[PDB]
Enzyme design. Structure first.
Site, PDB file in Angstrom:
ATOM      1  N   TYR A   1       0.935  -1.147   0.000  1.00 58.33           N
ATOM      2  CA  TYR A   1       0.000   0.000   0.000  1.00 58.33           C
ATOM      3  C   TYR A   1       0.961   1.178   0.000  1.00 58.33           C
ATOM      4  O   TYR A   1       0.798   2.056  -0.857  1.00 58.33           O
ATOM      5  CB  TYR A   1      -0.962   0.035   1.187  1.00 58.33           C
ATOM      6  CG  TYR A   1      -1.948   1.170   1.065  1.00 58.33           C
ATOM      7  CD1 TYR A   1      -2.912   1.167   0.072  1.00 58.33           C
ATOM      8  CD2 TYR A   1      -1.886   2.269   1.902  1.00 58.33           C
ATOM      9  CE1 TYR A   1      -3.809   2.212  -0.069  1.00 58.33           C
ATOM     10  CE2 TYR A   1      -2.775   3.324   1.776  1.00 58.33           C
ATOM     11  CZ  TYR A   1      -3.740   3.296   0.787  1.00 58.33           C
ATOM     12  OH  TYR A   1      -4.620   4.330   0.657  1.00 58.33           O
TER      13      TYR A   1
ATOM     14  N   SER B   1      -5.351   0.230  -5.006  1.00 55.73           N
ATOM     15  CA  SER B   1      -5.519   1.677  -5.040  1.00 55.73           C
ATOM     16  C   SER B   1      -4.156   2.341  -5.155  1.00 55.73           C
ATOM     17  O   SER B   1      -3.457   2.170  -6.159  1.00 55.73           O
ATOM     18  CB  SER B   1      -6.271   2.175  -3.803  1.00 55.73           C
ATOM     19  OG  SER B   1      -6.752   3.492  -4.002  1.00 55.73           O
ATOM     20  N   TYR B   2      -3.767   3.097  -4.126  1.00 56.82           N
ATOM     21  CA  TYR B   2      -2.401   3.593  -4.064  1.00 56.82           C
ATOM     22  C   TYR B   2      -1.398   2.458  -4.176  1.00 56.82           C
ATOM     23  O   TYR B   2      -0.334   2.625  -4.783  1.00 56.82           O
ATOM     24  CB  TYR B   2      -2.187   4.372  -2.768  1.00 56.82           C
ATOM     25  CG  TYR B   2      -0.917   5.178  -2.741  1.00 56.82           C
ATOM     26  CD1 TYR B   2       0.295   4.577  -2.452  1.00 56.82           C
ATOM     27  CD2 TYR B   2      -0.924   6.536  -3.013  1.00 56.82           C
ATOM     28  CE1 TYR B   2       1.457   5.299  -2.423  1.00 56.82           C
ATOM     29  CE2 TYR B   2       0.239   7.268  -2.990  1.00 56.82           C
ATOM     30  CZ  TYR B   2       1.427   6.640  -2.693  1.00 56.82           C
ATOM     31  OH  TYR B   2       2.600   7.346  -2.665  1.00 56.82           O
TER      32      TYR B   2
ATOM     33  N   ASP C   1     -16.610   2.790 -10.203  1.00 50.95           N
ATOM     34  CA  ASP C   1     -15.759   3.291  -9.132  1.00 50.95           C
ATOM     35  C   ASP C   1     -15.928   4.798  -9.015  1.00 50.95           C
ATOM     36  O   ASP C   1     -15.541   5.546  -9.916  1.00 50.95           O
ATOM     37  CB  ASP C   1     -14.306   2.924  -9.403  1.00 50.95           C
ATOM     38  CG  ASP C   1     -13.455   2.962  -8.156  1.00 50.95           C
ATOM     39  OD1 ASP C   1     -13.663   3.867  -7.324  1.00 50.95           O
ATOM     40  OD2 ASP C   1     -12.578   2.088  -8.010  1.00 50.95           O
TER      41      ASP C   1
ATOM     42  N   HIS D   1     -15.464   1.239  -5.558  1.00 50.42           N
ATOM     43  CA  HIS D   1     -14.040   1.115  -5.265  1.00 50.42           C
ATOM     44  C   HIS D   1     -13.733  -0.112  -4.421  1.00 50.42           C
ATOM     45  O   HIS D   1     -12.722  -0.783  -4.649  1.00 50.42           O
ATOM     46  CB  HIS D   1     -13.531   2.361  -4.549  1.00 50.42           C
ATOM     47  CG  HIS D   1     -12.043   2.408  -4.413  1.00 50.42           C
ATOM     48  ND1 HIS D   1     -11.405   2.387  -3.193  1.00 50.42           N
ATOM     49  CD2 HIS D   1     -11.066   2.469  -5.348  1.00 50.42           C
ATOM     50  CE1 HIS D   1     -10.099   2.433  -3.381  1.00 50.42           C
ATOM     51  NE2 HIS D   1      -9.867   2.485  -4.679  1.00 50.42           N
TER      52      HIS D   1
END
Ligand SMILES: *[C@@H]1O[C@H](CO)[C@@H](O[C@@H]2O[C@H](CO)[C@@H](O[C@@H]3O[C@H](CO)[C@@H](O)[C@H](O)[C@@H]3O)[C@H](O)[C@H]2NC(C)=O)[C@H](O)[C@H]1NC(C)=O
Ligand SMILES: *[C@@H]1O[C@H](CO)[C@@H](O[C@@H]2O[C@H](CO)[C@@H](O)[C@H](O)[C@H]2NC(C)=O)[C@H](O)[C@H]1NC(C)=O
Ligand SMILES: *[C@@H]1O[C@H](CO)[C@@H](O[C@@H]2O[C@H](CO)[C@@H](O)[C@H](O)[C@H]2NC(C)=O)[C@H](O)[C@H]1NC(C)=O
Ligand SMILES: *[C@@H]1O[C@H](CO)[C@@H](O[C@@H]2O[C@H](CO)[C@@H](O)[C@H](O)[C@H]2NC(C)=O)[C@H](O)[C@H]1NC(C)=O
Ligand SMILES: *[C@@H]1O[C@H](CO)[C@@H](O[C@@H]2O[C@H](CO)[C@@H](O)[C@H](O)[C@H]2NC(C)=O)[C@H](O)[C@H]1NC(C)=O
Ligand SMILES: *[C@@H]1O[C@H](CO)[C@@H](O[C@@H]2O[C@H](CO)[C@@H](O)[C@H](O)[C@H]2NC(C)=O)[C@H](O)[C@H]1NC(C)=O
Ligand SMILES: *[C@@H]1O[C@H](CO)[C@@H](O[C@@H]2O[C@H](CO)[C@@H](O)[C@H](O)[C@H]2NC(C)=O)[C@H](O)[C@H]1NC(C)=O
Ligand SMILES: *[C@@H]1O[C@H](CO)[C@@H](O[C@@H]2O[C@H](CO)[C@@H](O)[C@H](O)[C@H]2NC(C)=O)[C@H](O)[C@H]1NC(C)=O
Ligand SMILES: *[C@@H]1O[C@H](CO)[C@@H](O[C@@H]2O[C@H](CO)[C@@H](O)[C@H](O)[C@H]2NC(C)=O)[C@H](O)[C@H]1NC(C)=O
Ligand SMILES: *[C@@H]1O[C@H](CO)[C@@H](O[C@@H]2O[C@H](CO)[C@@H](O)[C@H](O)[C@H]2NC(C)=O)[C@H](O)[C@H]1NC(C)=O
Ligand SMILES: *[C@@H]1O[C@H](CO)[C@@H](O[C@@H]2O[C@H](CO)[C@@H](O)[C@H](O)[C@H]2NC(C)=O)[C@H](O)[C@H]1NC(C)=O
Ligand SMILES: *[C@@H]1O[C@H](CO)[C@@H](O[C@@H]2O[C@H](CO)[C@@H](O)[C@H](O)[C@H]2NC(C)=O)[C@H](O)[C@H]1NC(C)=O
Ligand SMILES: *[C@@H]1O[C@H](CO)[C@@H](O)[C@H](O)[C@H]1NC(C)=O
Lengths: 209, 727, 727
Positions: B508, B591-592, B669, B701
């Protein structure tokens, strides 16, 4: 000649911060008219009484008039520490004053402005990171430096206007915030009357034989 | 013995059992045993039945959630729950008069309210419907309207828009009751000039024409929503008089340009504190304002402002910390970084700018949980110098020299990650151990710190797990230069120190995040380690925190540069232990984490065989304004546009030629728009690089729908199997 | 030797050279060589320079295409070409005075004109700009406005909407000059109540916010656009006079309900023929009207009208055939179905209803190409009884029992598929052979069918290909019941008739269409057969043509029932030969072929291991009105709604348990919208079946972008290689 009250009856009523001032010297005023053109809600006098402006002759009169909602009657009251004295209108207690909150009757020809307004914050922010707030408080009888951001009035309540100040002004972004109060059915006005002695060799008098 | 299979994850055969209680008094709490609501006395443990088990409470509709009034006289029941955003949802509400027998049927709360809240005391209600605020003094009385400017997708009264809900407040509610319950403060968000993101929604199969969802979403360098703040006196509401809302103006140093409201906390009954933040995340301001009875307005004296400024980076972890006020309300405590770049507790007087630190050391206080007149309780990671541990300590209000640990010796082997929930007035507190051993919920009395009874031990879960091949967890550090950095490795059971095991990196690596700690989890990595024998590694790099600001702010205004290099370095040091196979290494992230995975694969190191990115960020102009501008400022040619253009995944697209890439993104999303994945796909196509793709229609998401969850996880597991050649 | 590799395809190493000419007179034609344009005399072959390599013609803009005036006085140059639809596009136009040297500078064709057209004689210009019709009598004079109701997306003047262009006219133009050019007829389309389909377009990387493209698109059972028809006297427009447009009313039998216009044919000047077809495609009306100059009205009696009706199914192949009127205009020949359901030439007098047939047999006339005073020339498939072969015939107009084949004996071995283009007045004609050998372009004289010269032989291409391992093509038929159906196989080079080859089924199987033919093609199948030794098979069952109405209409109102069953049966029959591996059969198709693939995979036969569908159709209620409603009627409960519901792919979703599915779709597909594949994926997820998918951003139905084309074909090649365990 008769005292000229005509400027008070032309155009939109001025706001509390953009108040207007009339100086009377060497004239006579008709009390019959002034009794009818306004309905007084409150007569508050410091070191002075109405039963003496209406029967005595004075070296000078000075009237500061503005549009003021009756609901905020005591906010203007002397010795209050509210926004009104800080950014809008501070009247010297030492100046003899008869603050009057009244109501304009329907047929009197004083134009109603849009909703009332007052300056919530006027500050000379400065500093390297703009950290310093250094608020600006008006001296008695002095217009706010935040008077010109919107002279007519405030378009929406809680409005912000930022105008950079040059070195002559003192430096930093001058900041202003304005609050909006809904207009009532009848235009309600505030008056500050001051009597000056020995300011000349001519007098202001009630019309009398 | 038998192992933890993928189905065991997917079917939740091994259910984590919780003990969630809600303090309603200083010595009693509620608990939903069965689906009835028992009331428990802390001191004896004796239990009685508050609400009986039956369909009487609603009857005719399935009951979703409920909320008890503070006086216990009424129950608010919601049904027809429809989630819209992460926290946004709508549902219908009924009020059951628990006092005698029956529901209240007159003046029912509307059939589409967006949020409902009790007063702290009494039985007042405030709810939001059609973006307007309505107040009920009594459940069986008609409602009083507070706001009239509510308009769909334009003006939000008392409710948050998308960006404030997701990144600023991390909560849907935008109204706060007074401690006594007399004042109700709320925020109004104006999104008139915010551009709309539009995407396709297909809905049920029978729908002939797909619809277009339009969401107000300020991207990086777009017009941000404006926010105003008001308070209403609920005691003055009358039937034939419009509600009066007094406005609180933001501080002058703040409203020079775009600004955000961080949070609002009531001090005393008539004293309030607000946190404002400049759009360029620096110069946070705490303002304290008092109610003036003579003047309904709130006077925020200049001398009571407090400033927070950062140089190496931004302000706070994600948001300026909320202050905890004393009983009188003339002093408080705040978490603030010290001169050495470590977060500690400072004691502030409301009229003084200087703070006196009460804690000091090479560690960070995580949070203030409760404040009494004589002790302060807090969670910190001082114990053993372990950033991934959390422990409860108390400090005397009089002498700061005495610091006592309440959790260090309670169960050291099974507990290094504590959390606490204090009762009203702090007579008792429940401790939750979520550290390396099975979570443990206990109750203790603050008076003399005596353990009272075990609330939940998960003993049945332990007995079930005794026949299952659970993996092991290792937490350690590696020294890079003159600084150590922490990492964790989920090791398969019966882990051999000589064999070569494959390494899959869960990443992450987001700023302020932490993936290496002592929390016990049963998740996808657990299945990987148990059944497929994959070592799952995670590493804390140079924006990861609870470790300092020297490490925390190293990635300021240079996102995606130091974290990627740190991950590469971590893999390189991981290479030379005999338990890591250099040929087969993969990096997955979400995500990130997807962005980091893509940038790592586009680095050209050649270490990683393949990688998975789930809804990755691709270009920081495509993300929402607040999050990106926190670390990157504004993308303008004079300020930082050069680094914006350089840090795109697409610019490194050609480097993907040597590795296998898997891209997954849901079409609906609302957080990371499909546009990012579409642009990645376009770049990979017109550079002629083969890759795999997967879209999940109508998914958000989180991809939290059950079937989509199953499908995505089995697809990712199959992809991992083939890339590592596990079959 | 070298084999035909993927790179050989995608870089187009082996290019086909063709010979495109445009007749301008009785015996001369132009031909575009490299950069210059030459004029060629047919009878002698001598050539002259019409236009030189004027690279400086726009000295700064590349000329995309050019248009020759009938009289040769002017030349039209087009540039800035921007494709919008399959045929719709916008471009800028300039007019060059070919007579000495100069371009035209005063009054020029606008930048965003949608269509431009020469008059048949003279040098009149008619163009459409902003959906409005403008006419220039001379290139150097201002245009006269003809239409005033033009409004984008609402009213279309002179050009077609989406559905009329795509399904009815197969062209953007909707205006037709009189043969002498004295009159100009045109259509006006009203799409006010046509529903809009919206889809997301992401555009170039730098665009921060995606745009929404909205298209007027009538789905199955929606409001169709309305059409009005007008005629203008081109000779009468003046600068001080508004344009006068005489409207032509639809026939009385047509006004009862919704209707379409099929096409327009000038039956001499003054006399015109228009074909209308009702929304239900089972009845059609040809109306002929004569202009009355002495009154200015169109007094066209009902008695000269003709009607066409069908019982088994719809009228025509896609539309009623084109009428070819005699020189006098009192008689004409049409292609219509006979008693037993075969299309042949019927001769019509304008004054009687009954038609006299002049041709008959168990074969089909594909087209009528030219009409002289004594002979009629037509392309038919009678030779060798092969529906996949095309040959040119002529018949005497007086005694039609005299038939002469113009292509049967000239090249039986190399050529079996001919097309032809006659010169003006049909003195000379160009024959183009497209298979099974290399294309051959020749020119012949009508007088005595004497071959003059070979225009294109592609000899160098053959000699250079002679060292490359080309595949082979086999064409044959099989019998099911009393009916024969044709098939073709692309066989690998050095094809062994005994050893076991794997099989891929290329399917389109669309109604009226034909995939088994004699055409030589270099395509993906060629590379697959050359390199992967894969046999690529195609099969034409019901309801494909061109084999009579018995097969054509057998699938009426039963889409996906007989066609899919026949495909499965064909695959099973294919299995039983000794050279095909039943365990290693794959299936793929595009568009309607995608629908067929989805249906056969969802059948549960188990004979197909895995399959690829690109832009598949899944539910006819999602597709356009005209195409579906031709075969299914209206999706209403009393007519055919049950069969609409019984033929969706999603209902078969679970049956995908046994097969591996790859789904590919462009998100900017305006014909088969992304909604369709999105719903396919949603159903597949909701039944939890594993599959592969890969989307192409901003690509249309054809995926004609060079890089996108390369990527899609290499991705499909990798997938089929993996599925088939070839490498
Ligand atoms: C030929 O017929 C067409 C029919 O469309 C005439 O066009 C229309 O003419 C009317 C009257 O001049 C226009 O109305 C005007 O609109 C303007 C808008 O600014 C307004 O200011 C005027 O007071 C008046 O209402 C109308 O807009 C116009 N329509 C179009 C599409 O142009 C045309 O004028 C006739 N004559 C010619 C020049 O051939
Ligand atoms: C557990 O038992 C205690 C007594 O040991 C209960 O305490 C009583 O609470 C009621 C509340 O109305 C008081 O009126 C009594 O005076 C209390 N003590 C006595 C003497 O009974 C306590 O409420 C019980 N808790 C539960 C939830 O059962
Ligand atoms: C909330 O919605 C329900 C329907 O879901 C409403 O209940 C209906 O009320 C009408 C009028 O009395 C009846 O005819 C229906 O039969 C009722 N349906 C059900 C299922 O109860 C209810 O009145 C609505 N309440 C509010 C607050 O608007
Ligand atoms: C809760 O606390 C508030 C704030 O102290 C109380 O409001 C004040 O009450 C005192 C005592 O009656 C008055 O003198 C003040 O003028 C009130 N201030 C206002 C207008 O807020 C409130 O009465 C308390 N009680 C409740 C409602 O719980
Ligand atoms: C939300 O924002 C809009 C735009 O700022 C406000 O509407 C404008 O208000 C200004 C005065 O500040 C007027 O000059 C404009 O003409 C108004 N129209 C627009 C759309 O620009 C609106 O008042 C705000 N609403 C609230 C409740 O704050
Ligand atoms: C309180 O103020 C709101 C302002 O919106 C009033 O609502 C409007 O009232 C006027 C009549 O005065 C109507 O013409 C508008 O249509 C109303 N708008 C809305 C949003 O309903 C409301 O009536 C006032 N209530 C009072 C006077 O107590
Ligand atoms: C807080 O952020 C501000 C920007 O709002 C920083 O302002 C900088 O001011 C210096 C003055 O010389 C300029 O050279 C910089 O270019 C400005 N930076 C930006 C981002 O515009 C201010 O320095 C910051 N405070 C810190 C980091 O301590
Ligand atoms: C091909 O050659 C013939 C002559 O053999 C050309 O026809 C002549 O054209 C000229 C004008 O250029 C006339 O004056 C002659 O009378 C024509 N003679 C005949 C026999 O027709 C013909 O134009 C040439 N064509 C091309 C395209 O080069
Ligand atoms: C148009 O341009 C082409 C080149 O693209 C010219 O063709 C060449 O002409 C010369 C001289 O006759 C030959 O030697 C070359 O072999 C030709 N082709 C090549 C490969 O360049 C052509 O002559 C030009 N025509 C005009 C009318 O200018
Ligand atoms: C079509 O557009 C081009 C611009 O793309 C126009 O050309 C411009 O004309 C103006 C006015 O004469 C010049 O100032 C510009 O320099 C020209 N630009 C270019 C690129 O040539 C052109 O006139 C337009 N044509 C029509 C028919 O409208
Ligand atoms: C296309 O059809 C629409 C019908 O939807 C026409 O719009 C109508 O126009 C008439 C005459 O002005 C009005 O009386 C109707 O009320 C309109 N209907 C609607 C709902 O718009 C439109 O004029 C037609 N366009 C043309 C020129 O054919
Ligand atoms: C053309 O098609 C229509 C619609 O299918 C036919 O009309 C229906 O025909 C069936 C069978 O004869 C009847 O049962 C229905 O009652 C008819 N009405 C409806 C529902 O439209 C029509 O007969 C067909 N005409 C031709 C020329 O075959
Ligand atoms: C509530 O449900 C539990 C079982 O979950 C049951 O034992 C109990 O008796 C129920 N209470 C009732 C029906 O009052």
């Amino acid at each position: 000649t008769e005292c000229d009250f005509s400027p008070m009856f032309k155009g939109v009523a001025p706001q509390v911060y953009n108040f207007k001032r009339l100086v009377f010297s060497n004239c006579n005023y008709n009390l019959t008219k002034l009794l009818s053109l306004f309905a007084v809600d409150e007569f508050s006098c410091n070191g002075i009484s109405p039963d003496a402006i209406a029967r005595g002759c004075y070296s000078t009169l000075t009237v500061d008039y503005f549009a003021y909602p009756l609901s905020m009657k005591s906010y203007i009251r002397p010795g209050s520490a509210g926004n009104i004295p800080l950014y809008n209108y501070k009247q010297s207690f030492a100046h003899p004053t008869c603050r009057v909150l009244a109501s304009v009757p329907p047929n009197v020809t004083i134009t109603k402005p849009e909703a009332y307004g007052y300056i919530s914050k006027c500050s000379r922010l400065t500093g390297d990171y703009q950290h310093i707030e250094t608020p600006l408080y008006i001296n008695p009888g002095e217009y706010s430096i935040c008077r010109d951001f919107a002279p007519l009035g405030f378009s929406e309540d809680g409005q912000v206007f930022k105008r950079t100040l040059t070195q002559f002004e003192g430096g930093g972004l001058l900041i202003g915030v304005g609050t909006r109060v809904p207009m009532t059915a009848n235009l309600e006005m505030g008056f500050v009357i001051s009597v000056q002695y020995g300011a000349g060799t001519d007098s202001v008098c009630p019309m009398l034989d | 013995r038998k192992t933890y299979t993928l189905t065991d994850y997917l079917k939740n055969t091994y259910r984590l059992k919780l003990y969630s209680l809600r303090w309603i008094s200083d010595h009693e709490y509620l608990y939903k045993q069965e689906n009835n609501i028992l009331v428990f006395n802390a001191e004896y443990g004796n239990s009685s039945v508050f609400l009986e088990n039956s369909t009487f409470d609603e009857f005719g509709h399935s009951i979703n959630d409920y909320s008890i009034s503070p006086d216990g006289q009424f129950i608010l029941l919601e049904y027809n729950y429809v989630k819209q955003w992460r926290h946004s949802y709508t549902a219908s509400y009924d009020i059951y008069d628990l006092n005698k027998r029956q529901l209240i049927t007159e003046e029912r709360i509307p059939n589409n309210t967006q949020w409902v809240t009790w007063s702290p005391v009494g039985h007042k209600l405030a709810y939001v419907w059609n973006n307007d605020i309505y107040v009920k003094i009594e459940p069986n009385l008609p409602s009083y309207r507070i706001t009239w400017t509510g308009k769909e997708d334009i003006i939000y009264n008392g409710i948050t828009d998308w960006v404030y809900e997701e990144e600023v407040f991390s909560a849907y509610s935008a109204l706060w009751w007074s401690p006594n319950g007399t004042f109700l403060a709320y925020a109004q968000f104006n999104d008139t000039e915010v551009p709309l993101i539009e995407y396709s929604f297909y809905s049920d199969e029978s729908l002939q024409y797909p619809k277009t969802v339009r969401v107000p979403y300020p991207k990086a360098g777009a017009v941000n929503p404006t926010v105003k703040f008001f308070v209403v006196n609920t005691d003055s509401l009358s039937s034939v008089t419009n509600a009066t809302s007094i406005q609180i103006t933001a501080p002058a140093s703040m409203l020079i340009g775009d600004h955000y409201l961080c949070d609002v906390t009531w001090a005393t009954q008539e004293r309030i504190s607000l946190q404002w933040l400049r759009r360029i995340q620096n110069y946070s301001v705490m303002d304290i304002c008092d109610y003036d009875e003579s003047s309904g307005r709130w006077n925020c004296l200049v001398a009571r402002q407090h400033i927070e400024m950062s140089t190496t980076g931004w302000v706070g972890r994600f948001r300026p910390s909320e202050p905890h006020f004393t009983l009188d309300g003339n002093s408080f405590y705040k978490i603030i970084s010290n001169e050495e770049g470590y977060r500690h507790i400072c004691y502030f007087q409301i009229d003084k700018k200087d703070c006196t630190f009460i804690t000091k050391g090479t560690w960070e206080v995580i949070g203030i949980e409760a404040l009494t007149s004589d002790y302060l309780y807090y969670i910190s990671n001082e114990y053993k110098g372990m950033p991934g541990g959390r422990n409860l300590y108390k400090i005397q209000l009089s002498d700061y020299t005495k610091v006592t640990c309440l959790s260090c010796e309670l169960n050291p082997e099974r507990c290094q990650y504590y959390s606490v929930s204090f009762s009203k007035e702090a007579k008792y507190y429940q401790l939750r151990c979520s550290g390396p051993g099975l979570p443990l919920y206990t109750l203790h009395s603050s008076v003399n710190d005596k353990g009272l009874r075990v609330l939940e031990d998960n003993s049945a879960l332990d007995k079930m797990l005794q026949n299952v091949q659970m993996p092991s967890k290792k937490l350690d550090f590696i020294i890079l230069n003159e600084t150590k950095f922490w990492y964790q490795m989920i090791l398969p059971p019966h882990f051999d120190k000589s064999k070569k095991y494959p390494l899959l990196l869960d990443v992450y690596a987001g700023p302020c995040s932490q993936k290496a700690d002592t929390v016990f989890r049963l998740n996808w990595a657990t299945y990987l380690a148990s059944t497929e024998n994959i070592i799952v590694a995670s590493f804390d790099g140079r924006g990861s925190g609870y470790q300092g600001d020297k490490i925390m702010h190293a990635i300021n205004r240079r996102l995606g540069t130091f974290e990627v290099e740190d991950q590469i370095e971590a893999a390189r040091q991981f290479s030379k232990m005999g338990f890591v196979d250099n040929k087969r290494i993969a990096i997955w992230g979400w995500s990130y984490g997807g962005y980091v995975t893509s940038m790592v694969l586009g680095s050209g190191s050649g270490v990683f065989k393949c990688g998975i990115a789930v809804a990755p960020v691709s270009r920081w102009e495509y993300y929402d304004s607040v999050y990106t501008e926190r670390y990157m400022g504004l993308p303008t040619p004079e300020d930082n546009l050069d680094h914006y253009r350089n840090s795109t995944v697409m610019s490194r697209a050609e480097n993907f030629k040597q590795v296998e890439y898997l891209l997954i993104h849901g079409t609906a999303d609302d957080n990371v728009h499909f546009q990012q994945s579409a642009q990645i796909s376009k770049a990979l196509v017109d550079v002629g690089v083969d890759f795999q793709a997967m879209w999940y229609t109508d998914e958000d998401h989180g991809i939290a729908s059950s079937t989509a969850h199953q499908h995505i996880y089995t697809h990712m597991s199959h992809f991992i199997k083939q890339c590592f050649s596990l079959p």
